[PDB]
Write an enzyme that holds these catalytic residues in place. Structure first.
Site, PDB file in Angstrom:
ATOM      1  N   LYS A  22      34.304  28.375  35.685  1.00 49.60           N
ATOM      2  CA  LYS A  22      35.495  29.221  35.649  1.00 49.60           C
ATOM      3  C   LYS A  22      35.832  29.507  34.194  1.00 49.60           C
ATOM      4  O   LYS A  22      35.946  28.591  33.370  1.00 49.60           O
ATOM      5  CB  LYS A  22      36.668  28.586  36.411  1.00 49.60           C
ATOM      6  N   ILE A  66      30.334  35.437  40.419  1.00 55.12           N
ATOM      7  CA  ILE A  66      30.485  35.461  41.876  1.00 55.12           C
ATOM      8  C   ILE A  66      31.893  35.864  42.313  1.00 55.12           C
ATOM      9  O   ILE A  66      32.081  36.258  43.456  1.00 55.12           O
ATOM     10  CB  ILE A  66      30.014  34.144  42.529  1.00 55.12           C
ATOM     11  N   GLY A  67      32.860  35.747  41.414  1.00 54.44           N
ATOM     12  CA  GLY A  67      34.250  36.083  41.694  1.00 54.44           C
ATOM     13  C   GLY A  67      34.977  36.521  40.448  1.00 54.44           C
ATOM     14  O   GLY A  67      34.731  35.974  39.368  1.00 54.44           O
ATOM     15  N   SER A  68      35.882  37.517  40.589  1.00 51.16           N
ATOM     16  CA  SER A  68      36.661  38.053  39.465  1.00 51.16           C
ATOM     17  C   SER A  68      38.033  37.406  39.298  1.00 51.16           C
ATOM     18  O   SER A  68      38.759  37.214  40.266  1.00 51.16           O
ATOM     19  CB  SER A  68      36.788  39.567  39.569  1.00 51.16           C
ATOM     20  N   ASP A  93      49.761  27.475  47.629  1.00 51.53           N
ATOM     21  CA  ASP A  93      48.951  28.652  47.975  1.00 51.53           C
ATOM     22  C   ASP A  93      47.893  28.302  48.993  1.00 51.53           C
ATOM     23  O   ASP A  93      46.702  28.539  48.780  1.00 51.53           O
ATOM     24  CB  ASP A  93      48.369  29.385  46.745  1.00 51.53           C
TER      25      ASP A  93
END
Ligand SMILES: OCc1cc(-c2c[nH]nc2-c2ccc(F)cc2)ccn1
Length: 288
Positions: free
Chosen positions: A33, A14-16, A123
């Site tokens: 992850k 779903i995410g790089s 962040d």
């Protein structure tokens, strides 16, 4: 048959890297992850330790598993909902004042909780806040401790020393002016970043966003200069005074100052009450 920790079925990326997963024992949906074991600078094991120390806090995701398997370092987390960035784009980059205030209240508390556990996030950005699922659908979670640093000793509460010449650790768009100046980040910088995120939600964009330059380096200089050259009163013109009050308060904090989180939350709660908004969790995404 393709599993992690011998229990979590690996699903779509779903995410790089982040994947969907399914706990085969419980049937529960998870997020996986993965970090290549051969990466130059290992971060996943360090990040797992931060999550573990944060466990039990409101809006802190549960870490289910972590370890090394084959070519990867693995961390399994409970599945959450979309990020505030995903929701903001879904709402065509316009949030109503009510939604911004509902979000501000929980985001200040998440930051306060991380600080109470002796860390600074470093962040603070919309992408790092996710909504929960089902019953926890109105709960804002904070994620990504990859850039998080301990700012004080667990035992004595002795603050880390003031230091200069620090690299920009975070997203330039939301970095505090101190971060742009290379000053060691502290509690004030997480809160100042939150102030820019709230103004980004109010405005739809920030005045230092979409600036063009030949290199990343020149781009960060342009963002820094533009952020420095934009007075808080100019940035917040046409929006309730509380947003300017919040930002001036954060910029006024000294390096080792304990922020008054209760005061900042109350500024926004008082505005929510004055506005006559209904006390429900009907966000802008629920109006689409
Ligand atoms: O929206 C689905 C969703 C995404 C994420 C997510 C988004 N960025 N990073 C993560 C993540 C995933 C696993 C992990 F171990 C640590 C961080 C977490 C939970 N649910």
């Amino acid at each position: 048959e393709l599993r992690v920790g011998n229990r979590y079925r690996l699903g779509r990326k779903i995410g790089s890297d982040i994947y969907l997963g399914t706990d085969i024992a419980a049937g529960e949906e998870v997020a996986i992850k993965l970090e290549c074991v051969k990466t130059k600078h290992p971060q996943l094991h360090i990040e797992s330790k931060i999550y573990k120390m944060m466990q039990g806090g409101v809006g802190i995701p549960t870490i289910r598993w972590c370890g090394a398997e084959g070519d990867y370092n693995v961390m399994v987390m409970e599945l959450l909902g979309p990020s505030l960035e995903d929701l903001f784009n879904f709402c065509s980059r316009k949030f109503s004042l009510k939604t911004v205030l509902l979000l501000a209240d929980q985001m200040i508390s998440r930051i306060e909780y991380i600080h109470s556990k002796n860390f600074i996030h470093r962040d603070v950005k919309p992408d790092n806040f996710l909504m929960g699922l089902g019953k926890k659908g109105n709960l804002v979670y904070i994620i990504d401790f990859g850039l998080a640093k301990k700012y004080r000793d667990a035992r004595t509460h002795q603050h880390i020393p003031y230091r200069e010449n620090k690299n920009l650790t975070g997203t330039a768009r939301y970095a505090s002016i101190n971060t742009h100046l290379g000053i060691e980040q502290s509690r004030r910088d997480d809160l100042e970043s939150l102030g820019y995120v709230l103004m980004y939600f109010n405005l739809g964009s920030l005045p230092w966003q979409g600036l063009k330059a030949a290199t990343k380096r020149q781009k960060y200089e342009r963002i820094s200069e533009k952020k420095m050259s934009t007075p808080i009163e100019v940035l917040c013109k046409g929006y309730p005074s509380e947003f300017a009050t919040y930002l001036n308060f954060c910029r006024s904090l000294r390096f080792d100052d304990k922020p008054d989180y209760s005061y900042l939350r109350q500024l926004f709660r008082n505005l929510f009450h004055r506005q006559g908004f209904s006390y429900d969790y009907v966000f802008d995404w629920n109006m689409l």
